[PDB]
Amino acid sequence: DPVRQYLHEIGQVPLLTLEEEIDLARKVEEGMEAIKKLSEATGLDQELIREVVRAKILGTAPDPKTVEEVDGKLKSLPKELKRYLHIAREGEAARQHLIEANL
Amino acid sequence: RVDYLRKERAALRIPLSAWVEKEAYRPGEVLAELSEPYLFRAEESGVVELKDLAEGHLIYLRQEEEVVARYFLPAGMTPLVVEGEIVEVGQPLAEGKGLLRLPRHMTAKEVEAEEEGDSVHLTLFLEWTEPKDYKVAPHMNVIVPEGAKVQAGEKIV
DNA sequence: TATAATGGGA
């Protein structure tokens, strides 16, 4: 019975309060806007930063080259512009939890 | 909860006989030991704004939007007016009864001195920590952490 | 493209 398996799995993730629902939706929109301001600072495409942030969050494993060299360039940025890196990371974490809590 | 650091220059008038003479003032010490009650009078006109402090008071006499005189009511000087009253020149605002002191959470520095007969006109620089609580709704997110030293004009929430 | 809706069914 795979249906009882999946219902139990989405059962472990508790529902989210209206405060958490506003906070997660906030960090999502903040992260998405943090990505666009990185496409202005660094100069590369939105979807590129989008996937490099998704990688470094949801899983460890070109993997050694293109992914790490883009993240390395992002890590070698001023403090005032590395804020938007951290904001994008937690914003992508917020998207994950927003999805999981509403399955 | 935000504990502000508030500072203000305020005027005061007491008899010379009671004034314990100093230049820099600490919280709690005696500023004057009055032999008999004294009526601390307004020297200007306007509407009074009565801000109650920890164990002191501050009278704000204002005409239009500007301020005509900042008034300091030390401990042991009970106000004779109510928040939102009309006063004119010569009307008493507080009665100095007993010996008057500085409030326990307030510091007075840069005191002036103007003696006219038995009366002395003081304008001192006060500093005290005034807490103020703030309510935040779910549609609001806090920006500063616990214990964050903050400055004026900055967004807290 | 927006009321809110949050663990199946034989």
Angle between helices A46-58 and A18-41 in degrees, nearest 10:
130
Method: X-ray
Cα gap B144→B157, rounded to integer Å: 7
Strand-pair category, B57-63 with B46-52: antiparallel
Q: Which residues touch strand C (CB under 7 A)?
A: A 1, 3-4, 7-8, 10-12, 15-16, 21, 101-103
Tally of CB atoms within 10 A around A57: 15
Closest chain A residue to B139 measured between Cα atoms?
A22
Contact B105, B32 (CB under 8 A): no
Q: Quick check: A27 and A63 in contact, CB under 8 A?
A: no
- Tokens representing A53 are 């942030």
Task: Mention every residue, 6+ apart, whose C-beta is less than 8 A from residue B130.
Answer: B3, B4, B6, B53
Breaks (C–N over 2.5 Å) after residues, chain A? 61
> Six-digit token pair at B28?
């709690």
Closest chain A residue by Cα to residue B136: A19
CA B151 to C1' C6, whole Å: 43
Kindly provide the resolution of this structure in angstroms, with one decimal.
2.6
Q: Answer whether A91's CB lies under 8 Å from A31's CB.
A: yes
Displacement of CA A5 from its chain's centroid (Å): 27
Residues on chain A touching B141 (C-beta within 8 angstroms): 23, 26
A4 nearest nt, CA–C1': C8
Instruction: Determine, for residues B141 and A18 on separate chains, whether the beta-carbon distance falls below 8 Å.
Output: no
Q: Which residues pair with B94 in a beta bridge?
A: B40, B79
How distant is the alpha carbon of residue A11 from its chain centre?
A: 23
**The nucleotide closest to A15 (CA, C1' atoms):** C6
Backbone torsions φ then ψ of A46, nearest 5 degrees: -60, -55
Region for A95 from its dihedrals, namely left if φ exceeds 0, alpha if ψ lies in -120 to 50, beta otherwise: alpha
Both tokens of residue A11?
Answer: 């059962």
Helix (H) or strand (E) holding A18: helix A18-41
First vs last Cα of chain B: how many Å apart? 12
Residue B88 corresponds to which tokens in the numbers above? 């004119």
The whole-number Å distance from A31's CA to C3's C1' is 28
Catalogue the E-assigned strands of chain B.
2-15, 30-33, 38-41, 46-52, 57-63, 66-73, 75-79, 85-87, 92-101, 106-109, 115-116, 119-132
Give residue for tokens 């520095």: B109
Q: Which nucleotide is nearest to A9 (CA to C1')?
A: C7
**In whole angstroms, what is the distance from residue B22 CA to residue B44 CA?**
27
Rounded to a whole number of angstroms, the CA Rg of chain A reads: 16
How far is Cα B97 from Cα B88, in angstroms, rounded to an integer?
22
Is B135 within 8 Å of chain A by CB?
A: no
**Which residue of chain A is at minimal alpha-carbon distance from B138?**
A19
Chain C: positions less than 7 Å from a protein CB are 6-9
Question: Which residues of chain A have a CB within 8 Å of the CB of B137?
Answer: none
- Cβ B89 vs Cβ B43: under 8 Å: yes
Q: Which two tokens stand for residue B47?
A: 């509407």
Task: Give bridge partners of residue B120 from the DSSP assignment.
Answer: B14, B115
**Across-strand partners of A88?**
none
